[PDB]
Amino acid sequence: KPFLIVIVGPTASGKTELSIEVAKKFNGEIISGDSMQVYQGMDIGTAKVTTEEMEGIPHYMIDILPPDASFSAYEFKKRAEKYIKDITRRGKVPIIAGGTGLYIQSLLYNYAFEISEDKMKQVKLKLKELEHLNNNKLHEYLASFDKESAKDIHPNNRKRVLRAIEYYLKTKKLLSSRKKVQQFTENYDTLLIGIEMSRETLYLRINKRVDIMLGHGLFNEVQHLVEQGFEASQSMQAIGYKELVPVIKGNISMENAVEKLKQHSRQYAKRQLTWFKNKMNVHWLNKERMSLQMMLDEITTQINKRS
């Protein structure tokens, strides 16, 4: 299987910068995983990296279609698989920056996929009620459900044991099974890494990124797009455009709209963080404790094994 680096994380969380730094230390090339950066003309609302910021590193999947064009998880897979081969073929390191759960797993595994806020409380509450249990008592508990998991996971690795107990309690199904199928249907020798952070910092940064976008001409952009008739298009329905279109007509106030724009952005970021934790096995880097350089070292240590 071909080596592939995957760096997911919320918008402007450093995933983009980190990708380039990794690309510069291992002469690789980046494939944009964002399903919006594919449209030309939509640069501000999508946090599209500029040619200058790319620092020479070549990027793909950016400005490859017009707004009225259609895109999808598989469309991304078809194009990404070709680039990942071409890249490796030229002795380089294929790196995908960004992307959502669907787009990423659809690309990583060859299987058809298959979450209520209530279970969030039940599972979390029940887990916090499991903090009491010693290392072995909690292991026994895991054994009762997933024999295969508790079998190999040593009782002193509380982390992996909770992850298994956590997964079960939510989906109510086999955990060691997702492991198996994902382990066999995997197309690449993936090094999946994600940038994490507390909901507090996350939500605060998002509100701040929405302020900057407005300050950089986001509204002016949706104006040029809506004027070019690109309205009614799938792209114009993405968070950051669908909220502003109404205010351009005068049906909603800028204040109220922006209020909804920062909200949809917060919910979206959350939903994406949730998915990457309950479906993927990502090596999370806590952004609230590491820096661009510190992260590049965590990855450098991980890469000094694959070799």
CB 267, CB 296: distance < 8 Å: no
d(CA 19, CA 32): 10
| 101 labelled ligand-binding | no
Q: Is 208 within any annotated ligand binding site?
A: no
46 assigned binding-site residue = no
8 Å CB contact between 257 and 240: no
Report whether 155 belongs to an annotated binding site.
no
235 is in an annotated binding site: no
Q: Which residues are annotated as a binding site?
A: 9-16
- Please report, in range form, the residues annotated as the binding site for ATP: 9-16
Positions at the binding site for substrate: 11-16
